[PDB]
Design an enzyme around this catalytic site. Structure first.
Site, PDB file in Angstrom:
ATOM      1  N   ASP A   7       0.856  -1.179   0.000  1.00  0.00           N
ATOM      2  CA  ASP A   7       0.000   0.000   0.000  1.00  0.00           C
ATOM      3  C   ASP A   7       0.896   1.234   0.000  1.00  0.00           C
ATOM      4  OD1 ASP A   7      -2.435   1.279  -0.133  1.00  0.00           O
ATOM      5  OD2 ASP A   7      -2.790   1.232   2.035  1.00  0.00           O
ATOM      6  N   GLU A  67      -0.624  -0.976  -5.746  1.00  0.00           N
ATOM      7  CA  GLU A  67      -1.868  -0.273  -6.022  1.00  0.00           C
ATOM      8  C   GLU A  67      -1.648   0.782  -7.100  1.00  0.00           C
ATOM      9  OE1 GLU A  67      -3.622   2.788  -3.415  1.00  0.00           O
ATOM     10  OE2 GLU A  67      -4.892   1.190  -2.604  1.00  0.00           O
ATOM     11  N   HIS A 131      -3.859   0.251   6.415  1.00  0.00           N
ATOM     12  CA  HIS A 131      -2.830   0.236   5.381  1.00  0.00           C
ATOM     13  C   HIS A 131      -2.243  -1.152   5.154  1.00  0.00           C
ATOM     14  CE1 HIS A 131      -2.306   4.565   4.412  1.00  0.00           C
ATOM     15  NE2 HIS A 131      -2.891   4.712   5.587  1.00  0.00           N
ATOM     16  N   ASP A 134      -4.956  -3.302   3.062  1.00  0.00           N
ATOM     17  CA  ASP A 134      -5.025  -3.181   1.609  1.00  0.00           C
ATOM     18  C   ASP A 134      -3.831  -3.844   0.935  1.00  0.00           C
ATOM     19  OD1 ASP A 134      -4.982  -2.064  -1.156  1.00  0.00           O
ATOM     20  OD2 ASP A 134      -6.595  -0.775  -0.420  1.00  0.00           O
TER      21      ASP A 134
END
Ligand code: MG
Lengths: 147, 156
Positions: A7, A67, A131, A134
């Protein structure tokens, strides 16, 4: 089989390690790296790269999932981009291929917290922290997409 | 006394090395690094970090001067720019070399003299101050200009 999800960020860096197949995933490790406020940009960058580097050497992931980048502010985008390049450099120095997934794509593969309960369920644990959650999500998402 | 100047980019990375002080300065080294677009982004940020760390390790600069990113109109573009900028900043921290930024204002100001982005004159004053017969590339020239600019703000 082993995958590291990240993340990305500068004030926070979510890292998540899982292992397994498409049907079964084994949770290995998760953490959220937070570089504090009053350091110069290079010092913050040094901490993130050192710590990231330390985890890629030991855990020896076979893939890194990251991401995709979304934010309208330009100074923030420049600061966030500096951490993103230092993360992309650490993987390259480790030789770990890096795959990119969008926020929607991870939601498909698993105010809104459904995603957090799907990662917890598939790894059979307990994540308080938003955090590290994800990052695991991205690690699980790479497994599904992986052939 | 020894200053490395960096014009940061992903396609082009100007690096300029210079020793001396304000009144006179010695030219040591300058180059423009490029990365083919065939490589993925990580493979490019590794090459620049590698060639930067190399020059940083041989020449042991006293300080690093870098072009200030005061360009500020698109978030998507600043993010793409920031990736290169952060790999450059990390190599310096890893080398322990303090970083000073200067706006394009100060470069031309501290070189032409009350200049206003007189780009050809700035380049002209780079060759004269460092006694260089040929300085073809604008990125290495800019990086050379930044090194001289920190030398002008020298503390003594
Ligand atoms: Mg430039």
């Amino acid at each position: 089989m082993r995958v590291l999800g990240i993340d990305p960020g500068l004030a926070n860096l979510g890292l998540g390690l899982v292992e397994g197949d498409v049907r079964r995933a084994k949770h290995l490790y998760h953490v959220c790296l937070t570089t504090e406020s009053a350091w110069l940009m290079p010092r913050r960058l040094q901490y993130l790269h050192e710590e990231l580097t330390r985890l890629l050497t030991e855990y020896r992931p076979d893939a890194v999932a990251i991401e995709d980048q979304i934010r309208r502010q330009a100074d923030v985008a420049f600061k966030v981009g500096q951490a993103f390049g230092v993360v992309q450099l650490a993987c390259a120095q480790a030789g770990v291929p890096i795959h990119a997934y969008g926020p929607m794509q991870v939601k498909k593969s698993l105010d809104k917290e459904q995603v957090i309960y799907m990662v917890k369920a598939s790894l059979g644990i307990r994540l308080f922290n938003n955090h590290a959650a994800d990052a695991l999500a991205l690690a699980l998402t790479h497994l599904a997409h992986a052939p």
